[PDB]
């Protein structure tokens with residue numbers, strides 16, 4: 045797949061991603077906060093089409109992500125991220141995609157998520173998060 | 178060396 049790396053910012057304003065109910069997660073793109081002003085991150089598109097778009101718009105800065113969780117699984121012989129759920133201090137967004145395979149979850153007790161990096165081919169291959177105070 | 182750094186967790190999904 046095609047690797048990407050957004051880098052670190054000062055916060056998160058909007059997350060936009062797409063999924064498919066039979067396969068996994070496709071496109072991924074995020075609007076970050078850069079010192080009090082919006083910042084449009086590059087858009088990480090999938091190599092194929094057919095996904096459903098989802099827009100998650102946080103009420104920044106009073107609302108922020110407090111737990112990220114999902115499922116990773118085997119699709120067409122490849123290991124990919126199959127589901128994704130974002131829970132904040134106000135509401136939960138998810139799950140999106142198939143909830144099947146091996147689950148992972150990252151609850152934050154103190155700190156913030158300020159950046160993302162990963163890789164997408166047909167589906168999102170893997171990803172990592174940037175943490176901070 | 179002149180670039181700031183931050184902690185990073187993952188990846189989750191395919192290896193390497």
Ligand SMILES: CO[C@H]1O[C@H](CO)[C@H](O)[C@H](O)[C@H]1O
Nearest residue numbers: 045122164165166167168169
């Ligand atoms: C069908 O293969 C394409 O997508 C898969 C799954 O996302 C892998 O990323 C692979 O590297 C890429 O060529």
